[PDB]
mmCIF file of C-alpha atoms and ligand atoms in Angstrom:
data_model
loop_
_atom_site.group_PDB
_atom_site.id
_atom_site.type_symbol
_atom_site.label_atom_id
_atom_site.label_comp_id
_atom_site.label_asym_id
_atom_site.label_seq_id
_atom_site.Cartn_x
_atom_site.Cartn_y
_atom_site.Cartn_z
ATOM 1 C CA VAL A 698 105.386 68.263 91.357
ATOM 2 C CA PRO A 699 103.885 68.198 87.498
ATOM 3 C CA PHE A 700 100.702 70.544 86.694
ATOM 4 C CA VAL A 701 100.797 72.817 90.252
ATOM 5 C CA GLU A 702 101.422 75.672 87.579
ATOM 6 C CA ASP A 703 98.399 75.100 85.326
ATOM 7 C CA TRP A 704 95.023 77.270 86.860
ATOM 8 C CA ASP A 705 91.487 76.575 84.947
ATOM 9 C CA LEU A 706 89.378 79.603 84.469
ATOM 10 C CA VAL A 707 85.827 79.331 85.818
ATOM 11 C CA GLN A 708 83.820 82.520 86.376
ATOM 12 C CA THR A 709 83.949 86.024 85.691
ATOM 13 C CA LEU A 710 84.748 87.996 88.377
ATOM 14 C CA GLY A 711 84.507 91.808 86.894
ATOM 15 C CA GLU A 712 85.359 93.929 83.904
ATOM 16 C CA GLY A 713 87.956 96.132 84.310
ATOM 17 C CA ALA A 714 88.884 98.974 81.253
ATOM 18 C CA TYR A 715 90.846 97.527 78.791
ATOM 19 C CA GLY A 716 90.264 93.774 79.602
ATOM 20 C CA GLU A 717 88.331 90.951 82.238
ATOM 21 C CA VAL A 718 89.166 89.765 85.881
ATOM 22 C CA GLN A 719 88.830 85.795 85.665
ATOM 23 C CA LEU A 720 88.594 83.118 89.120
ATOM 24 C CA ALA A 721 91.179 80.698 88.424
ATOM 25 C CA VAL A 722 91.375 77.368 90.396
ATOM 26 C CA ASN A 723 95.121 75.268 90.228
ATOM 27 C CA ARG A 724 94.753 71.666 88.826
ATOM 28 C CA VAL A 725 96.533 70.479 91.522
ATOM 29 C CA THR A 726 95.680 72.084 95.061
ATOM 30 C CA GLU A 727 92.245 73.524 93.455
ATOM 31 C CA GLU A 728 93.816 76.703 95.527
ATOM 32 C CA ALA A 729 91.680 79.655 93.945
ATOM 33 C CA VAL A 730 93.261 83.249 92.798
ATOM 34 C CA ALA A 731 91.693 86.004 90.544
ATOM 35 C CA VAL A 732 93.251 86.388 87.313
ATOM 36 C CA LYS A 733 93.453 90.066 85.775
ATOM 37 C CA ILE A 734 93.711 90.172 81.978
ATOM 38 C CA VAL A 735 94.906 93.946 80.629
ATOM 39 C CA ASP A 736 96.087 94.044 76.067
ATOM 40 C CA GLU A 737 102.309 103.008 81.781
ATOM 41 C CA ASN A 738 99.176 102.644 83.949
ATOM 42 C CA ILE A 739 99.382 98.530 84.054
ATOM 43 C CA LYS A 740 102.855 99.141 84.486
ATOM 44 C CA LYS A 741 102.337 101.266 87.882
ATOM 45 C CA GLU A 742 99.913 98.523 88.753
ATOM 46 C CA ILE A 743 101.933 96.003 88.871
ATOM 47 C CA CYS A 744 104.822 98.579 90.395
ATOM 48 C CA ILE A 745 102.448 99.641 92.958
ATOM 49 C CA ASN A 746 101.444 96.281 93.535
ATOM 50 C CA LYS A 747 104.904 94.725 94.143
ATOM 51 C CA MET A 748 105.765 97.160 96.889
ATOM 52 C CA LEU A 749 102.046 95.877 98.953
ATOM 53 C CA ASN A 750 101.827 93.699 101.575
ATOM 54 C CA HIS A 751 98.880 94.081 104.413
ATOM 55 C CA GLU A 752 96.008 91.405 105.200
ATOM 56 C CA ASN A 753 93.375 94.373 104.325
ATOM 57 C CA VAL A 754 95.039 95.178 100.950
ATOM 58 C CA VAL A 755 94.587 92.490 97.928
ATOM 59 C CA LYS A 756 97.394 89.844 97.955
ATOM 60 C CA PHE A 757 99.629 90.520 94.626
ATOM 61 C CA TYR A 758 101.471 87.078 93.858
ATOM 62 C CA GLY A 759 102.965 88.105 90.781
ATOM 63 C CA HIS A 760 102.534 88.413 86.926
ATOM 64 C CA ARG A 761 103.069 86.857 83.383
ATOM 65 C CA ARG A 762 103.816 88.721 80.288
ATOM 66 C CA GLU A 763 102.486 86.958 77.153
ATOM 67 C CA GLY A 764 103.305 89.109 74.052
ATOM 68 C CA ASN A 765 100.100 92.163 73.947
ATOM 69 C CA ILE A 766 98.201 90.148 77.285
ATOM 70 C CA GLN A 767 99.743 90.632 80.522
ATOM 71 C CA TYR A 768 98.270 88.156 83.303
ATOM 72 C CA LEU A 769 98.155 90.256 87.238
ATOM 73 C CA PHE A 770 97.461 87.070 89.661
ATOM 74 C CA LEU A 771 95.772 88.156 92.523
ATOM 75 C CA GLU A 772 94.415 87.421 95.434
ATOM 76 C CA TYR A 773 90.761 85.480 95.346
ATOM 77 C CA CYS A 774 88.150 87.136 97.886
ATOM 78 C CA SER A 775 85.256 84.664 97.754
ATOM 79 C CA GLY A 776 82.657 87.786 100.064
ATOM 80 C CA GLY A 777 82.650 89.380 96.171
ATOM 81 C CA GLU A 778 82.347 93.331 96.668
ATOM 82 C CA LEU A 779 81.096 95.235 99.376
ATOM 83 C CA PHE A 780 78.683 96.985 97.279
ATOM 84 C CA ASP A 781 76.855 94.076 97.749
ATOM 85 C CA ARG A 782 76.409 94.001 101.477
ATOM 86 C CA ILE A 783 74.843 97.613 101.216
ATOM 87 C CA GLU A 784 70.629 97.224 101.026
ATOM 88 C CA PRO A 785 69.806 100.559 98.671
ATOM 89 C CA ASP A 786 68.437 102.983 100.818
ATOM 90 C CA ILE A 787 68.982 100.979 104.032
ATOM 91 C CA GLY A 788 72.480 100.486 104.335
ATOM 92 C CA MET A 789 73.699 97.855 106.562
ATOM 93 C CA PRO A 790 73.563 97.405 110.621
ATOM 94 C CA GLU A 791 75.850 99.733 112.532
ATOM 95 C CA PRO A 792 78.209 97.010 114.212
ATOM 96 C CA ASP A 793 78.967 95.487 110.269
ATOM 97 C CA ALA A 794 79.654 99.067 109.330
ATOM 98 C CA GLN A 795 81.901 100.328 111.616
ATOM 99 C CA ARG A 796 83.996 96.957 111.454
ATOM 100 C CA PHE A 797 83.948 97.295 107.278
ATOM 101 C CA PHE A 798 85.215 101.033 108.587
ATOM 102 C CA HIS A 799 88.025 99.936 111.161
ATOM 103 C CA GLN A 800 89.410 97.472 108.232
ATOM 104 C CA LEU A 801 89.333 100.207 105.950
ATOM 105 C CA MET A 802 91.422 102.378 108.308
ATOM 106 C CA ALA A 803 93.613 100.082 108.486
ATOM 107 C CA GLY A 804 94.616 99.642 104.938
ATOM 108 C CA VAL A 805 94.448 103.284 104.391
ATOM 109 C CA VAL A 806 96.741 103.957 106.986
ATOM 110 C CA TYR A 807 99.081 101.785 105.850
ATOM 111 C CA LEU A 808 98.891 102.624 102.074
ATOM 112 C CA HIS A 809 100.030 106.214 103.139
ATOM 113 C CA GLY A 810 102.762 105.026 105.907
ATOM 114 C CA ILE A 811 104.905 103.313 102.406
ATOM 115 C CA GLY A 812 103.512 107.078 100.115
ATOM 116 C CA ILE A 813 100.510 105.698 98.327
ATOM 117 C CA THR A 814 97.647 106.687 97.274
ATOM 118 C CA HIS A 815 94.383 104.696 95.699
ATOM 119 C CA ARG A 816 92.825 107.491 94.588
ATOM 120 C CA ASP A 817 89.436 105.573 93.547
ATOM 121 C CA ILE A 818 88.332 104.220 97.499
ATOM 122 C CA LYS A 819 84.372 102.873 96.584
ATOM 123 C CA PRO A 820 82.741 99.785 97.683
ATOM 124 C CA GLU A 821 83.683 97.963 94.343
ATOM 125 C CA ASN A 822 86.895 98.144 95.351
ATOM 126 C CA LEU A 823 86.541 97.088 98.812
ATOM 127 C CA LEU A 824 86.093 93.295 98.920
ATOM 128 C CA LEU A 825 85.782 91.081 101.255
ATOM 129 C CA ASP A 826 87.487 87.209 102.156
ATOM 130 C CA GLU A 827 85.659 84.386 103.185
ATOM 131 C CA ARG A 828 85.802 85.768 106.992
ATOM 132 C CA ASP A 829 83.879 88.807 105.348
ATOM 133 C CA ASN A 830 87.491 90.702 106.049
ATOM 134 C CA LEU A 831 87.616 93.957 103.892
ATOM 135 C CA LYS A 832 90.636 94.280 101.243
ATOM 136 C CA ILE A 833 91.129 97.190 99.109
ATOM 137 C CA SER A 834 91.376 96.253 95.414
ATOM 138 C CA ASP A 835 92.677 98.196 92.189
ATOM 139 C CA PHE A 836 95.728 99.904 92.253
ATOM 140 C CA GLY A 837 95.258 101.258 88.491
ATOM 141 C CA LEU A 838 94.656 104.809 89.567
ATOM 142 C CA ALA A 839 96.621 104.497 92.130
ATOM 143 C CA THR A 840 100.234 106.451 92.667
ATOM 144 C CA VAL A 841 103.521 107.425 94.633
ATOM 145 C CA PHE A 842 102.805 110.950 96.786
ATOM 146 C CA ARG A 843 105.785 110.784 98.675
ATOM 147 C CA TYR A 844 108.905 109.360 97.926
ATOM 148 C CA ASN A 845 112.579 110.381 100.368
ATOM 149 C CA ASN A 846 110.104 111.591 102.437
ATOM 150 C CA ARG A 847 109.363 114.477 100.188
ATOM 151 C CA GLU A 848 105.417 114.525 99.462
ATOM 152 C CA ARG A 849 104.325 115.444 96.373
ATOM 153 C CA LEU A 850 101.353 117.522 95.272
ATOM 154 C CA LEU A 851 99.062 115.896 92.993
ATOM 155 C CA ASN A 852 96.935 117.736 89.942
ATOM 156 C CA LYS A 853 95.606 114.824 88.213
ATOM 157 C CA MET A 854 92.095 114.653 88.006
ATOM 158 C CA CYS A 855 90.682 110.745 88.688
ATOM 159 C CA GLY A 856 88.196 108.969 90.683
ATOM 160 C CA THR A 857 84.530 108.715 90.779
ATOM 161 C CA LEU A 858 82.144 111.405 90.730
ATOM 162 C CA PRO A 859 80.369 110.828 93.969
ATOM 163 C CA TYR A 860 83.518 109.787 96.264
ATOM 164 C CA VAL A 861 85.942 112.175 94.860
ATOM 165 C CA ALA A 862 86.950 115.446 97.192
ATOM 166 C CA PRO A 863 85.724 118.771 96.258
ATOM 167 C CA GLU A 864 89.110 119.926 96.499
ATOM 168 C CA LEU A 865 90.040 117.817 93.229
ATOM 169 C CA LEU A 866 87.080 120.038 91.604
ATOM 170 C CA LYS A 867 88.163 123.476 92.823
ATOM 171 C CA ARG A 868 92.086 123.467 93.215
ATOM 172 C CA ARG A 869 94.840 122.905 90.829
ATOM 173 C CA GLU A 870 96.803 121.317 93.411
ATOM 174 C CA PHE A 871 95.760 119.458 96.422
ATOM 175 C CA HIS A 872 97.114 117.316 99.014
ATOM 176 C CA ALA A 873 96.647 112.876 98.339
ATOM 177 C CA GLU A 874 95.938 112.004 102.113
ATOM 178 C CA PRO A 875 93.289 113.997 102.541
ATOM 179 C CA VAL A 876 91.299 112.661 99.073
ATOM 180 C CA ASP A 877 91.313 109.159 100.234
ATOM 181 C CA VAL A 878 89.854 110.525 103.826
ATOM 182 C CA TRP A 879 87.313 111.854 102.101
ATOM 183 C CA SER A 880 86.748 108.474 99.968
ATOM 184 C CA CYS A 881 86.147 106.722 103.314
ATOM 185 C CA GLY A 882 83.691 109.167 104.678
ATOM 186 C CA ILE A 883 81.450 108.850 101.344
ATOM 187 C CA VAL A 884 81.905 104.952 101.641
ATOM 188 C CA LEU A 885 80.474 105.090 105.530
ATOM 189 C CA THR A 886 77.664 107.272 104.521
ATOM 190 C CA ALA A 887 76.372 105.041 101.894
ATOM 191 C CA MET A 888 76.910 102.052 104.844
ATOM 192 C CA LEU A 889 75.059 103.519 107.116
ATOM 193 C CA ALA A 890 72.141 105.069 104.549
ATOM 194 C CA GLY A 891 72.763 102.841 101.523
ATOM 195 C CA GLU A 892 72.359 105.852 98.920
ATOM 196 C CA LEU A 893 75.113 108.337 97.656
ATOM 197 C CA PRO A 894 74.526 111.960 99.356
ATOM 198 C CA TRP A 895 75.586 113.828 95.931
ATOM 199 C CA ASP A 896 76.205 113.449 92.653
ATOM 200 C CA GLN A 897 79.747 115.174 92.994
ATOM 201 C CA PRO A 898 80.733 117.569 95.470
ATOM 202 C CA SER A 899 80.166 121.269 94.109
ATOM 203 C CA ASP A 900 78.617 124.324 94.847
ATOM 204 C CA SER A 901 75.821 123.865 91.769
ATOM 205 C CA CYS A 902 75.243 120.617 93.594
ATOM 206 C CA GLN A 903 71.922 121.092 95.707
ATOM 207 C CA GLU A 904 72.313 117.975 97.781
ATOM 208 C CA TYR A 905 75.675 118.921 98.631
ATOM 209 C CA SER A 906 74.949 122.824 99.679
ATOM 210 C CA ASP A 907 72.239 121.209 101.782
ATOM 211 C CA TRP A 908 74.883 119.419 103.879
ATOM 212 C CA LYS A 909 77.470 122.770 103.665
ATOM 213 C CA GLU A 910 74.383 124.269 105.634
ATOM 214 C CA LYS A 911 74.203 121.546 108.553
ATOM 215 C CA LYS A 912 70.601 120.277 106.995
ATOM 216 C CA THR A 913 71.200 117.032 108.573
ATOM 217 C CA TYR A 914 67.052 116.304 109.193
ATOM 218 C CA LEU A 915 67.020 115.365 105.129
ATOM 219 C CA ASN A 916 67.974 112.635 103.242
ATOM 220 C CA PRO A 917 70.515 110.546 104.083
ATOM 221 C CA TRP A 918 71.724 112.438 107.063
ATOM 222 C CA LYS A 919 67.948 111.608 108.961
ATOM 223 C CA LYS A 920 68.680 107.599 108.722
ATOM 224 C CA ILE A 921 72.112 108.062 110.214
ATOM 225 C CA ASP A 922 72.798 107.900 114.424
ATOM 226 C CA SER A 923 74.425 111.064 115.656
ATOM 227 C CA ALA A 924 77.897 109.412 116.722
ATOM 228 C CA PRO A 925 78.572 108.422 113.232
ATOM 229 C CA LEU A 926 76.843 111.761 111.853
ATOM 230 C CA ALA A 927 79.154 113.413 114.107
ATOM 231 C CA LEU A 928 82.096 111.674 112.841
ATOM 232 C CA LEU A 929 81.099 112.467 109.229
ATOM 233 C CA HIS A 930 80.672 115.771 110.110
ATOM 234 C CA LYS A 931 84.627 116.061 110.707
ATOM 235 C CA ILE A 932 85.447 113.808 107.809
ATOM 236 C CA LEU A 933 83.231 115.612 104.879
ATOM 237 C CA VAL A 934 84.861 119.368 105.387
ATOM 238 C CA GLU A 935 85.218 121.151 102.214
ATOM 239 C CA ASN A 936 88.504 122.349 103.126
ATOM 240 C CA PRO A 937 91.029 119.553 103.046
ATOM 241 C CA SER A 938 93.515 121.321 105.875
ATOM 242 C CA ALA A 939 90.974 121.351 108.321
ATOM 243 C CA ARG A 940 89.592 118.014 107.262
ATOM 244 C CA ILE A 941 90.132 115.243 110.250
ATOM 245 C CA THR A 942 93.283 112.963 109.515
ATOM 246 C CA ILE A 943 93.318 108.916 110.477
ATOM 247 C CA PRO A 944 95.041 109.266 113.806
ATOM 248 C CA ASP A 945 92.218 111.387 114.555
ATOM 249 C CA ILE A 946 89.180 109.500 113.234
ATOM 250 C CA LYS A 947 91.192 106.923 115.702
ATOM 251 C CA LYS A 948 89.975 108.774 118.450
ATOM 252 C CA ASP A 949 86.467 109.433 117.511
ATOM 253 C CA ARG A 950 83.689 108.485 119.779
ATOM 254 C CA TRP A 951 82.050 106.240 117.494
ATOM 255 C CA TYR A 952 85.073 104.768 115.884
ATOM 256 C CA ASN A 953 85.810 103.938 119.559
ATOM 257 C CA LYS A 954 82.659 102.819 120.397
ATOM 258 C CA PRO A 955 81.886 98.602 121.137
ATOM 259 C CA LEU A 956 79.009 97.542 118.827
ATOM 260 C CA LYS A 957 79.849 93.889 117.311
ATOM 261 C CA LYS A 958 80.370 90.923 118.917
ATOM 262 C CA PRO A 959 80.542 76.757 118.232
ATOM 263 C CA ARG A 960 79.061 76.138 121.457
ATOM 264 C CA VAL A 961 76.867 73.553 123.673
ATOM 265 C CA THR A 962 75.290 73.901 126.814
ATOM 266 C CA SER A 963 74.716 71.490 129.918
HETATM 267 C C1 HK9 B 5 92.322 94.018 90.010
HETATM 268 O O1 HK9 B 5 91.227 95.456 89.477
HETATM 269 C C2 HK9 B 5 90.070 94.340 89.367
HETATM 270 C C3 HK9 B 5 89.870 93.537 90.246
HETATM 271 C C4 HK9 B 5 88.457 93.133 90.308
HETATM 272 C C5 HK9 B 5 87.951 91.981 91.070
HETATM 273 C C6 HK9 B 5 88.997 91.173 91.466
HETATM 274 C C7 HK9 B 5 88.657 90.024 92.117
HETATM 275 C C8 HK9 B 5 87.390 89.736 92.685
HETATM 276 C C9 HK9 B 5 86.253 90.791 92.684
HETATM 277 C C10 HK9 B 5 86.393 91.859 91.326
HETATM 278 N N1 HK9 B 5 84.792 90.843 92.435
HETATM 279 C C11 HK9 B 5 84.020 89.160 92.895
HETATM 280 C C12 HK9 B 5 82.844 89.502 93.016
HETATM 281 C C13 HK9 B 5 82.016 88.463 93.001
HETATM 282 C C14 HK9 B 5 82.551 87.486 93.672
HETATM 283 C C15 HK9 B 5 83.627 87.117 94.041
HETATM 284 C C16 HK9 B 5 84.733 88.218 93.667
HETATM 285 N N2 HK9 B 5 86.290 88.161 94.144
HETATM 286 C C17 HK9 B 5 87.157 88.917 93.693
HETATM 287 O O2 HK9 B 5 88.226 88.582 94.841
HETATM 288 C C18 HK9 B 5 87.556 93.700 89.243
HETATM 289 C C19 HK9 B 5 88.256 94.941 88.349
HETATM 290 C C20 HK9 B 5 89.234 95.180 88.460
HETATM 291 C C21 HK9 B 5 89.171 96.049 87.746
HETATM 292 O O3 HK9 B 5 90.446 97.048 87.014
HETATM 293 O O4 HK9 B 5 88.639 97.179 87.717
#
């Protein structure tokens, strides 16, 4: 069928480190896709994306190399970013945050299962489809931590300071999985309190020192109910070896708490 391969660029969805992301509409079918234009880091992003197939991970349709500009065709999420569902200093209703946290855990369990660590989990990288289904986005910082069933320790410092785990700032080497678990706990905090707990998880940071002293009577913790706050007490643990794993998050009381729910009468 002619012109099925032609796409029109209608709107700017985002700006990457070395390029832009545009919403592309098919000329014949009017199907919407997101096109990432990038001029060892993009080669890794295409490669890691070629491995991914999960309902909570942004789908990779393919790539086209036209000289210097690399075109990445990705699943378009019409609901935008999770970041824009978080009301500043309020957050969002607890049943919505729980549903988004379930979908985030399903995505992260998947990624860790195939030996991939995202390394930059934050609400800007969590996209929502038309039914408000959460999708993990941007594999530009992602890496393989398990290959041929052998785990490799990470040492590269990356991500976003308010979301990074404290071992990333204190240790030369660290396990990849607890680092993503910690960033999920900061996302959960932002969803329930509408604010970030600290600038970075360091002893020089007063807000972080207050958390280690269990001063939950202060912000953001005073805004969070006791059941989700008990879960955050298990995630935001400084020692990554003592930090809760995802199989144990799936057994938490708040995680399994029932919270979220066309008809005519007579
Ligand atoms: C894949 O990487 C990115 C992806 C995006 C991106 C892609 C698709 C969407 C989106 C952002 N944001 C968005 C914002 C408003 C409304 C709709 C969307 N939909 C997207 O699917 C932006 C930046 C990067 C980056 O490289 O930093």
